[PDB]
């Protein structure tokens, strides 16, 4: 996921919980190949020729993330940062119910 919002310190791939989207682009993903990536990932702050962006308009109110990868492998990837936030928060909520009305 490209660094559309924010600088390198906060690799915000997608808008926040209550923020509003800009330029009618919600998120754009770029294919990555093992063979040739030296000249492809030089600058992630701008769009490239072969991109697959997603268009939407409005204000984002609700998100939900479903994952199928082990958490140990996801803990190290720096670009997949914001997701690692939300997923964790989500799990916390679930734990709450298991300790609340059990």
């Amino acid at each position: 996921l490209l660094n559309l919002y924010g600088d390198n310190e906060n690799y915000k791939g997608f808008p926040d919980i209550g923020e509003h989207i800009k330029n009618q682009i919600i998120a754009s993903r770029r294919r990555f190949d093992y063979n040739t990536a030296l000249y492809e990932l030089k600058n992630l702050n701008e769009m490239r020729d072969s991109d697959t962006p997603f268009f939407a308009d409005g204000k984002i109110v609700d998100i939900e993330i479903f994952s199928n990868v082990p958490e140990e492998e996801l803990k190290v990837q720096k670009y997949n940062e914001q997701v690692l936030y939300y997923i964790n928060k989500q799990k916390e909520f679930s734990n709450n119910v298991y300790q609340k009305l059990k």
């Binding site: 660094n3 390198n8 690799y11 990555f32 093992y34 990536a37 990932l41 030089k42 600058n43 992630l44 190290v76 990837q77 720096k78 670009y79």
Partner: peptide, 13 residues
């Protein structure tokens, strides 16, 4: 300093 955000792939390859 320009490749810092993506590090695991570079460390692997």
């Amino acid at each position: 300093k320009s490749y810092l955000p993506i590090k695991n792939i570079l460390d692997k390859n």
